[PDB]
A paper describes a structure:
Vertebrate oocytes are surrounded by a specialised extracellular coat that is referred to as zona pellucida in mammals (ZP) and vitelline envelope in non-mammals (VE). Accordingly, a recombinant construct corresponding to the predicted ZP-N1 domain of cZP1 (cZP1-N1) is secreted both as a monomeric and a disulphide-bonded dimer, whereas a protein encompassing the trefoil domain and C-terminal ZP module of cZP1 (cZP1L600-R958) does not form intermolecular disulphides. Thus, by recapitulating the oligomeric status of full-length cZP1, cZP1-N1 harbours its cross-linking function.
Accordingly, whereas mutation of cZP1-N1 N65 or hZP1-N1 N76 drastically reduces protein secretion, a cZP1 N121Q mutant is secreted as well as the wild-type and—because of its higher homogeneity—was used for crystallisation trials in parallel with hZP1-N1. Whereas the latter did not crystallise, we could grow crystals of cZP1-N1 expressed in human embryonic kidney (HEK) 293S GnTI- cells and treated with Endoglycosidase (Endo) H, as well as the same protein expressed in HEK293T cells. Remarkably, although they all contain the same C66-C66 cross-link, the moieties of the cZP1-N1 homodimers observed in our crystal forms adopt three distinct relative orientations. All the cZP1 cross-links have small interface areas that range from 330/412 Å2 (A-A′/B-B′ dimers of glycosylated cZP1-N1) to 575 Å2 (deglycosylated cZP1-N1 dimer). Additional contacts between residues in the ab loop/β-strand B region and amino acids in the cd loop stabilises the asymmetric structure of the deglycosylated cZP1-N1 cross-link; in particular, invariant Q38(B) stacks against highly conserved F57(A) and also makes water-mediated hydrogen bonds with the side chains of T59(A) and invariant D55(A).
Numbering used by the authors:
A (entry chain A): 22 to 127
B (entry chain B): 25 to 134
The structure:
Amino acid sequence: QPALLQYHYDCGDFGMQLLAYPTRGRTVHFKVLDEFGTRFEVANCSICMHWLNTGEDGGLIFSAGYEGCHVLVKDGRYVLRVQLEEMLLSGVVAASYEVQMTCPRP
Amino acid sequence: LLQYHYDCGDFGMQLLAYPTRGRTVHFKVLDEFGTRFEVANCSICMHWLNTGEDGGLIFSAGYEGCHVLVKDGRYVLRVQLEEMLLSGVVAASYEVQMTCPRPAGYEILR
Ligand SMILES: *[C@@H]1O[C@H](CO)[C@@H](O)[C@H](O)[C@H]1NC(C)=O
Ligand SMILES: *[C@@H]1O[C@H](CO)[C@@H](O)[C@H](O)[C@H]1NC(C)=O
């Protein structure tokens, strides 16, 4: 059960984007993690500065404004901890990945 | 007889409640005037509601969110828990004052 999902994040001017490229028709659901281990489903919420998009290349994009919900300022940097759930169209999680997005890098 | 407790974290706080068979809990944020504010995830107020893997209910609040007050050098957020039956009736009502430490700036070393 190899966990081979390709993903990365890019730091922008007003927010950051997490891009994942699932294969074989799979999809990816994003969950924000807080300091207590609680998992927050990501849904379009403009006042939170959270948006979900699918790129023209088939990649799935979670965009978060630096001043959006659960983005913290730590050591003069915006930090958001996110769980990526690689999923079959049946809804089962095949693999789960955790990434700490820190912007600006490093 | 509702079991609940809260935790003070570094950036926010969480209130955990464990209602019994078939009951649920509704959360409302209280201000100094007694207004009861419904909690919604999609909100500028930096507060959220989730259901744990054990069926427990979790209220999360950032320290800089709506109606969090500074009192005696500490963050204070008052929340009402309404224990509710499947009929929609309120079985019990509890009020909790979540008090969490706040840092005194460098001025303390005047
Ligand atoms: C908030 O999101 C959680 C999932 O992360 C969901 O279980 C809960 O019902 C939501 N509460 C709302 C929308 O008030
Ligand atoms: C969410 O918002 C984006 C940006 O406006 C939009 O492209 C998308 O269709 C919306 N709905 C989703 C992701 O379900």
